Scaffold this active site. Structure first.
Site, PDB file in Angstrom:
ATOM      1  N   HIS A 159      44.368  11.565 145.599  1.00 35.66           N
ATOM      2  CA  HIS A 159      43.594  12.404 146.514  1.00 35.66           C
ATOM      3  C   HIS A 159      42.137  12.582 146.074  1.00 35.66           C
ATOM      4  CE1 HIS A 159      43.750  15.925 143.872  1.00 35.66           C
ATOM      5  NE2 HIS A 159      45.069  15.990 143.930  1.00 35.66           N
ATOM      6  N   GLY A 173      39.948  22.054 139.870  1.00 35.31           N
ATOM      7  CA  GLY A 173      39.365  21.174 138.885  1.00 35.31           C
ATOM      8  C   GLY A 173      40.318  20.734 137.801  1.00 35.31           C
ATOM      9  N   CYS A 218      43.307  19.096 138.577  1.00 30.56           N
ATOM     10  CA  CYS A 218      44.091  17.956 139.044  1.00 30.56           C
ATOM     11  C   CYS A 218      43.816  16.737 138.171  1.00 30.56           C
ATOM     12  CB  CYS A 218      43.768  17.650 140.510  1.00 30.56           C
ATOM     13  SG  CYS A 218      43.904  19.108 141.604  1.00 30.56           S
TER      14      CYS A 218
HETATM   15  C1  LIG Z   1      42.419  19.316 142.542  1.00 26.25           C
HETATM   16  C2  LIG Z   1      42.439  19.231 143.944  1.00 26.25           C
HETATM   17  C3  LIG Z   1      43.642  19.492 144.744  1.00 26.25           C
HETATM   18  O1  LIG Z   1      43.806  18.645 145.809  1.00 26.25           O
HETATM   19  C4  LIG Z   1      44.831  18.800 146.698  1.00 26.25           C
HETATM   20  C5  LIG Z   1      44.916  17.837 147.685  1.00 26.25           C
HETATM   21  C6  LIG Z   1      45.936  17.966 148.614  1.00 26.25           C
HETATM   22  O2  LIG Z   1      46.110  17.079 149.631  1.00 26.25           O
HETATM   23  C7  LIG Z   1      45.202  15.984 149.711  1.00 26.25           C
HETATM   24  C8  LIG Z   1      46.857  19.029 148.554  1.00 26.25           C
HETATM   25  C9  LIG Z   1      46.741  19.973 147.562  1.00 26.25           C
HETATM   26  O3  LIG Z   1      47.623  20.998 147.508  1.00 26.25           O
HETATM   27  C10 LIG Z   1      45.713  19.875 146.592  1.00 26.25           C
HETATM   28  C11 LIG Z   1      45.540  20.835 145.512  1.00 26.25           C
HETATM   29  O4  LIG Z   1      46.291  21.833 145.356  1.00 26.25           O
HETATM   30  C12 LIG Z   1      44.443  20.591 144.612  1.00 26.25           C
HETATM   31  O5  LIG Z   1      44.254  21.474 143.599  1.00 26.25           O
HETATM   32  C13 LIG Z   1      41.237  19.030 144.632  1.00 26.25           C
HETATM   33  C14 LIG Z   1      40.052  18.855 143.953  1.00 26.25           C
HETATM   34  O6  LIG Z   1      38.874  18.627 144.609  1.00 26.25           O
HETATM   35  C15 LIG Z   1      40.041  18.899 142.563  1.00 26.25           C
HETATM   36  O7  LIG Z   1      38.859  18.721 141.906  1.00 26.25           O
HETATM   37  C16 LIG Z   1      41.226  19.132 141.864  1.00 26.25           C
HETATM   38  O8  LIG Z   1      41.136  19.160 140.500  1.00 26.25           O
END
Ligand SMILES: *c1c(-c2oc3cc(OC)cc(O)c3c(=O)c2O)cc(O)c(O)c1O
Ligand SMILES: *c1c(-c2oc3cc(OC)cc(O)c3c(=O)c2O)cc(O)c(O)c1O
Lengths: 306, 304
Positions: free
Chosen positions: A41, A143, A145
């Protein structure tokens, strides 16, 4: 004496953490040999969150659209591909800090350490269990992920988890390092039921053995039980059923304490039916289920790593 | 979201752990620049334990009585000296993995991570608080002596603790890295009382803020209290007295959550007087005191 929920030393994993940017998204990646692994993602925009077509989104990206930074060094991306829910970026330099490693898919109820990272920088390490419903009760701020979970055997890192998302319920979900989610989850921003969670019975038993080894004894009762009778009680209290495999892995602790496994099951049965009556075990008022039998043996034995 | 008792990443400290042997006693040492630090009781024998005269015992040792191994490689000891309760072994090689570091003496109630080691190799890492009575509740296996406690500020390691002994109660006691014990303890194998421990009140308040940030708000009320009135209750339940300094360091959590510090104090007062009645806070059935206000802010803001 005492008993701590210790994490694995994290140094070998710290040297593998990098920052991956695509578009306006920046998260954590894992750099092993000449490949960087991260959640797919990273290619989503805020408009792509509800149901991204990852195949179509990735076709729009070239190698130079992925920025990979290891410390202050910019890595050159020479290939990209998607494996299930993980993006794999081939870079032109092997990580000189790559440890001996394996990719493993763990079983529900097994434990591992998480190196929580933000934008490629390690923040903290903690030990946790994969819940029976394949969620993690973690500490993942935005941040985080791409942070990974792992075990260590002497000098070899077994990577078992990569963090992908927080569910609407506040619990966390992720994949193995081949990109296959643990549990029913998909990487999109939708309501997703994790279903009934249960207590990891074999881990509670291991922790009761740990308590005895530390000098606790108030909860040792006068009863015994059978596997089938105990499992009747376990199901009533949303505890995982106990198998002979579980009894077998508890063998070393039963031998050390002189307490037959079914006797300890009977004492757990009494705790479930009568409660704690305001008493504590190893300082805890609730029954702890994030120590595997192996975790207890390791701490009691002073097992060390490279 | 979520809230875990996280330890600092241990890699910078892992690169400093060595094995020190004197006679038949082997324990952990800390290798920084060209010095190895370890507990001076490494020079004790089994007949020396009850009341060692360390000055006399060290006088009988020369440099070659100390075997230091870093990885698979012996380090040459070229000097030795005692600073309070720590032995400093000068070696002929500076540790190439020496991080930026400082030696600090922490206050009771402050937190740090311990890299629990046996015979020079790490077993695991955990976060803990220095108890108000200057003891540490550590890991199970005795004989982790020389393991260190530390905090990390970006790239700089602040070493604050070296493990020296398990007291007869099983709790851990140790020194700062200048060898001064925390608490009244001495490095002899004798019955030594630690005295009354108390709950670290400012830390419990910090953890209640962490619970509110994570969505647990059932214990909040709109009662007023003063410091003096709160401390009347806290003293009854063996909680540390709360000072204006403690209120001041809780300010940032008050400012981000919209819950005044004295309001959280009134909530804690009710929790002590009424109990929790089977409810949990952050999944816990007891009040947690191993998070400082700074720890909560760090975790809730994602410091790395
Ligand atoms: C972590 C995320 C991050 O991205 C997502 C994407 C999803 O669907 C595409 C679902 C979902 O529940 C989700 C998260 O909970 C989540 O924390 C996004 C971003 O931009 C960054 O930097 C992360 O570390
Ligand atoms: C740790 C110890 C070790 O040594 C001591 C020495 C004492 O007085 C000289 C007192 C005391 O309580 C104590 C300990 O609790 C203790 O664990 C001894 C040895 O041999 C090794 O290897 C350690 O790691």
């Amino acid at each position: 004496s005492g008993f701590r929920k210790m994490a694995f030393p994290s140094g070998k994993v710290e040297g593998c953490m990098v920052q991956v940017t695509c578009g306006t998204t920046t998260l954590n990646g894992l750099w092993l040999d000449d490949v960087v692994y991260c959640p797919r993602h990273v290619i989503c925009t805020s408009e792509d969150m509800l149901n991204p077509n990852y195949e179509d989104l990735l076709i729009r990206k070239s190698n130079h659209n992925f920025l990979v930074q290891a410390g202050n060094v910019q890595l050159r991306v020479i290939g990209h591909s998607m494996q299930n829910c993980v993006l794999k970026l081939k870079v032109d330099t092997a990580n000189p800090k790559t440890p001996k490693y394996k990719f493993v898919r763990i079983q529900p109820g097994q434990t591992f350490s998480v190196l929580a990272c933000y934008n490629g920088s390690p923040s903290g390490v903690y030990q946790c269990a994969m819940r029976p419903n394949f969620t993690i009760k973690g500490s993942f701020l935005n941040g985080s992920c791409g942070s990974v979970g792992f075990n260590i055997d002497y000098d070899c890192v077994s990577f078992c988890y990569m963090h992908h998302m927080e569910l609407p319920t506040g619990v966390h979900a992720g994949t193995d390092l081949e990109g296959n989610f643990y549990g029913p989850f998909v990487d999109r921003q939708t309501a997703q039921a994790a279903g009934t969670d249960t207590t990891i019975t074999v881990n509670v038993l291991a922790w009761l053995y740990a308590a005895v080894i530390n000098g606790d004894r108030w909860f040792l009762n006068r009863f015994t039980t059978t596997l089938n009778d105990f499992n009747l009680v376990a199901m009533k209290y949303n505890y995982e059923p106990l198998t002979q495999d579980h009894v077998d892995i508890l063998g070393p602790l039963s031998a050390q304490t002189g307490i037959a496994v079914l006797d300890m099951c009977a004492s757990l049965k009494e705790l479930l039916q009568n409660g704690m009556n305001g008493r504590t075990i190893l300082g805890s008022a609730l029954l702890e289920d994030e120590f595997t039998p192996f975790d207890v043996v390791r701490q009691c034995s002073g097992v060390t790593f490279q």
